[model samples]
Target: YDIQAWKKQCEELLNLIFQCEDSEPFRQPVDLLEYPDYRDIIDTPMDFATVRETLEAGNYESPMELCKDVRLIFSNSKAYTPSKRSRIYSMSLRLSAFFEEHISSVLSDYKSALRFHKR
Candidate 1:
C-alpha cells in the first residue's frame, strides 16, 4: 500500500476541513484506484464550528495543535478508502482517544513542570 500517498491525502483532507472549503464536510473522495493523484469533484463546506468546538471543549491551544493531534491519532491506523460510487467517504476519528489518552494529562503535567522554571 502507498502509505505516503494516503498520508498526503489525509493531510489534504484535513486542510480542506480546517479551511471549511466544502459545504458537506463529512464527505470526501477516496483515493482512486486507477488514478494515483485523482482530484475530487467540487468543494463543500463542512461544519468547521463543530470541529472547532471539539478542540475548544477539549482545551486545545490552537488549530495547528489540533492538526498535530489528528496526525498522531492517524499514525498507527491504516487508510481505508471506500468505492468510487459511494457518495459518503467515512473514517474513524480518534479525537476522543487523544483527549482520554494524552491531552488532559500531558497538558497538566507540562504546565506543572513548566511552573518550576522561568520562561
Candidate 2:
C-alpha cells in the first residue's frame, strides 16, 4: 500500500477505537506530564499526544509514527479484552506492512534521484 492508503487505514483504525460507544474501556492513561523526561526521548515531531491530536484533526504529519503510537496505546490499555487486543494486533500487522512499503518506495526514489544527480 502507498502512503495515502496507509494514512487512511490509520485514520479509520483510530476512529474505530476512539469513536466507538464502548471507547471508554479502551481509554489508556497517557500522562505525559507525569514524565517530563519523555520529551528527551522523542526525536520526531510526533509524540503520543500529538499523534492522537493529529489523527483527530485529520492533518497528520507522519503516518508511520501515528500508526505505531495508535497500536501502542490500544495494546497497552489494561481494559482491553482479548478480542480487542487481537484486533489491535491485526491492525499492527497492516500498519507494519504499509510502513515497509512506504519506506521501500521512498528508498527507491532516493536512489534513482542520486543516480540521476551523479550522471
Candidate 3:
C-alpha cells in the first residue's frame, strides 16, 4: 500500500467530513449545525444542543441516530475507493471506531475519551 497516499486520502476525507459541503453529498451533514465545531476537531461528529436544535428545527426525530449514519457514510465513502490495497479502508473503519470511542470525551460528554480497543 502507498502509505502516504492512504494518509493523504484520509486527510482529504476528513476535510470533506468537516467542510460539510453539498456537492460532496457523502461528506455533507444532514444539517448545518451537524458540524458545530468543524473549525477545530475535524474528525468525529458529535451531538450538541445546537445540533439537537438544528435537528428539531428540521423535524429530525433522532440526531444521534442520524449522526451514526452520517459517520458511517463518511467512513465508507472514501474507504471503498479503487486502490492497490485496502489500507485506507482499514484506516477508515478504525477512524469511525475511534470517533465512536472518543466522541463522548471529545464532545465533553464524558470525563475523557480514553479506552482500550475491544476487538
Candidate 4:
C-alpha cells in the first residue's frame, strides 16, 4: 500500500484542524502553572504542535493513531476544565465534532481507493 498518500491526507486533515478559529488554545502544550493539577490528571498530554511534529517525523503507522492524539486534546480539556460551559470545554466540543465528520470522509475515501487498486 502507498502509505505516503494516506500520510499526505493526514497532514491535510491536521492543517484543516489547525486553521480552525477555536484551535488557538490547543496549538501548544497546556500551561501546567495555570493548572497545577493538569498532569496529575492528564496521563498523556497532547497538542497540535506535538501532533504536527509526530506526523512530520512519520511516527504514526495510520491515520487512526494521529486522530487518537488529536481527539485527546479535546477530551483532556474536558477532563481538566470541569465545567462543560467553560471556554476550552466548548471549543473542544466543536473541534471534536469537526474532526469526527472529516475523519470518516477520509477513511471512506481511502477504502474506496484500496478497492480500486485491488486486482
Q: Pick the candidate with the highest TM-score.
A: 4
**Tens digit of per-residue lDDT, candidate 4, span 1-119:** 45347688878878998899888889999988888898999998999999999989979877777878988998899888878799988988898898889888666666666767784
Give the worst 10-residue stretch by lDDT in candidate 1.
1-10
Candidates sorted on TM-score, descending:
4, 2, 3, 1
lDDT of 1 at 48: 32
- Cα error of candidate 2 at position 18, Å: 2.1
Q: Rate the local accuracy (lDDT) of all candidates.
A: 0.39, 0.48, 0.40, 0.84
RMSD of each: 14.3, 8.7, 15.1, 2.2
Q: Model 2 over residues 1-119: C-alpha lDDT tens digits? A: 23345455555555555554444433444346854554354332222345556766877555545656654543443233245456644554455454445445444544465557676
Q: Give per-residue CA lDDT, model 1, range 1-114, as digits (tens).
A: 221232333344445554442224232333357435433532222233444455546555433455554443333122223453333222334332423353444445445555
Q: What TM-score goes with each of the models?
A: 0.26, 0.35, 0.30, 0.86
Between the candidate structures 3 and 4, which one is better when assessed by TM-score?
A: 4
For model 2, the local distance difference test gives 0.48
Off by over 4 Å in 4: 1-3, 111-119
Error of 4 at 117 (Å): 7.1
Q: Model 4 Cα RMSD, Å?
A: 2.2
